[PDB]
Structure 1
Amino acid sequence: MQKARIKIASTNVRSLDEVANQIKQIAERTGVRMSGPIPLPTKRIRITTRKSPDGEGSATFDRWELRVHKRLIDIEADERAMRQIMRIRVPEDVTIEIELIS
Structure 2
Amino acid sequence: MQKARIKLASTNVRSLEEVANQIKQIAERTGVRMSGPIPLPTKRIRIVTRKSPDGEGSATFDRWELRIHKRLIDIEADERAMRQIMRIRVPEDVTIEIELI
* TM-score bucket (shorter structure): over 0.9
* 3-state SS in 1 of match to 2:100: strand
Whole-Å separation in 2 of the counterparts to 1:58 and 1:86: 56
Runs of 4+ in structure 1 over 2 Å off: none
Number of equivalent positions? 101
2:13 match: 13
Unaligned runs of 5+ in 2: none
Cα offsets for 1:56-89 (capped at 9, x unmatched): 1111110101110000001012111111112002
Residues 9-43 of structure 1: per-residue CA shift (max 9 Å, x gap): 00000011011011001011112111111010010
Identity rate of aligned residues, in percent? 96
* Aligned-partner Cα distance in 2 for 1:10–1:29: 26
Across the aligned residues of Structure 1 and Structure 2, the Cα RMSD in angstroms comes to: 0.9
2:25, 2:62 → 1: CA distance?
Answer: 42
Structure 1: segments with no counterpart, 5+ residues: none
Distance 2:76 2:89 in 1: 21
TM-score, normalization by structure 1: 0.94
Q: Post-superposition shift, 1:2?
A: 0.9
